[PDB]
Amino acid sequence: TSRLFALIPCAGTGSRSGSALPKQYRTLAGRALLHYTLAAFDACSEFAQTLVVISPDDAHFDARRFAGLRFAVRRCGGASRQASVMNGLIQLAEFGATDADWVLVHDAARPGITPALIRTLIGALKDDPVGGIVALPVADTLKRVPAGGDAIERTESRNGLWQAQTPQMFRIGMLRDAIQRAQLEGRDLTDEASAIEWAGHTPRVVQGSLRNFKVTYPEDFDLAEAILAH
Ligand SMILES: Nc1ccn([C@@H]2O[C@H](COP(=O)(O)OP(=O)(O)OP(=O)(O)O)[C@@H](O)[C@H]2O)c(=O)n1
Ligand SMILES: [Mg+2]
């Protein structure tokens, strides 16, 4: 009976992407970056609603560029990603969400997300007491490079290491309280799983895809444009 809610943190600036316009609004193959994320969730009718969190100062979001897609947008963006997620989780109650419902937090900067991968995550963790994330095992040899230079100090082990992606699937009640705990202890975490972990819970990993990579630096735009439109 647990309903499915989607939460798209979209209140970032994309400072590493070198784009003056927020990278989530950057046009790829004649289409906005965010549009690919929303279209993927829109294809999944089993979702109750998709909430997009944008900054209160966002003057670039144009709803007309996303017409036909089923989603809602709220200007409850925070100073950080975790804050934007926290405000979003609170905001979900407006749409009838409860603490027992699932929430799937997905980066807008990951346009390669597909309905198949969404439903793979859901189907694998729907009966899980905690939930989990989509992720990718570290395939490359890890090198330690001291900050400030390009010199390699030594080789680090990659055994048992995964690179976390999104969506990150957890219960609204457990996730909100976890982040609330993290903020109460002065911790700003990188993803939702981290809060779940520090709260004392054990999240799961589901095999992700390199197609689901996040656009982060100027190379990624043309690369995603190659990955997309295919
Ligand atoms: N204060 C913030 C910061 C990030 N995000 C969202 O979190 C997702 C992934 O975070 P990231 O890749 O780091 O995007 P940015 O923070 O905007 O870029 P940068 O880290 O280079 O500044 C993005 O969809 C971004 O919009 C958000 O909603 N509110
Ligand atoms: Mg960031």
Coil vs helix vs strand at 144: strand
For residue 81, the tally of other CB atoms under 10 A from its CB is 20
- How far, in Å, CA of 187 to CA of 165, rounded? 20
Nearest of 43, 36, 8, 224 to residue 119 by alpha carbon: 43
- Cβ contact 52:73 at 8 Å: yes
12 Cα: distance to centroid of ligand 2 (angstroms):
7
- Cα distances (angstroms) measured from residue 59 to each of 11, 35, 75, 78, 159: 11, 17, 11, 15, 45
| Ligand 1 neighbour 204 (Cβ under 6 A) | no
Closest ligand relative to 81 C-alpha: 1
- Cβ contact 15:216 at 8 Å: no
Write down the architecture of domain 1-230 according to CATH: Alpha-Beta Complex (3.90)
Directed axis angle between helix 115-125 and helix 33-42, to 10°? Answer: 50
Residue of 15, 61, 80, 81 to test ligand 1 pocket, by largest number of atoms within 8 Å of CB: 81
Tokens of 41: 């969730």
Tokens of 16: 């590493």
13 Cα: distance to centroid of ligand 2 (angstroms):
8
Instruction: Please return the burial class of 197, using the count of CB atoms within 10 Å of its CB with bins 0-12, 13-18 and 19+.
Output: middle
- How far, in Å, CA of 102 to CA of 122, rounded? 9
Tokens of 79: 């100073």
H/E element, 55: none
1 Cα: distance to centroid of ligand 1 (angstroms):
32
- How far, in Å, CA of 180 to CA of 87, rounded? 11
For residue 18, the tally of other CB atoms under 10 A from its CB is 11
For residue 51, the tally of other CB atoms under 10 A from its CB is 25
- How far, in Å, CA of 150 to CA of 90, rounded? 43
Closest ligand relative to 83 C-alpha: 1
Count the helix, strand and coil residues of the chain and give each as a percent rounded to the nearest 5. Answer: 35, 20, 45
| 3-state DSSP of 199-224 | CCCCCEEEECCHHHCCCCCCHHHHHH
Resolution (A): 2.3
- Cα distances (angstroms) measured from residue 184 to each of 188, 190, 192: 10, 16, 15
Of all atoms in ligand 1, which is nearest to the CA of residue 9? 28
Which stretches within the chain are classed as H helix?
33-42, 81-91, 115-125, 172-184, 192-198, 219-227
| Ligand 1 neighbour 111 (Cβ under 6 A) | no
Closest ligand relative to 108 C-alpha: 1
Coil vs helix vs strand at 189: coil
Of all atoms in ligand 1, which is nearest to the CA of residue 16? 21
Phi and psi at residue 21, to the nearest 5° = -75, 135
- Cα distances (angstroms) measured from residue 202 to each of 117, 153, 189, 227: 21, 33, 16, 33
* Ramachandran area for residue 186 (φ above 0: left; ψ -120 to 50: alpha; else beta): left
Phi and psi at residue 117, to the nearest 5° = -75, -35
| Ligand 1 neighbour 19 (Cβ under 6 A) | no
Nearest of 56, 6, 62 to residue 32 by alpha carbon: 62
For residue 128, the tally of other CB atoms under 10 A from its CB is 14
1 Cα: distance to centroid of ligand 2 (angstroms):
34
Q: In what order do the strands lie in the sheet with 102-105?
A: 72-74, 47-53, 4-9, 102-105, 162-171, 131-137, 204-207
| Ligand 1 neighbour 81 (Cβ under 6 A) | yes
Nearest of 95, 100, 65, 96 to residue 176 by alpha carbon: 100
**What technique was this entry resolved by?**
X-ray
Nearest of 20, 221, 204 to residue 125 by alpha carbon: 204
Phi and psi at residue 2, to the nearest 5° = -65, 120
Nearest of 187, 31, 192 to residue 107 by alpha carbon: 192
- Cα distances (angstroms) measured from residue 176 to each of 26, 38, 110, 141, 172: 30, 23, 23, 36, 6
Of all atoms in ligand 1, which is nearest to the CA of residue 110? 24
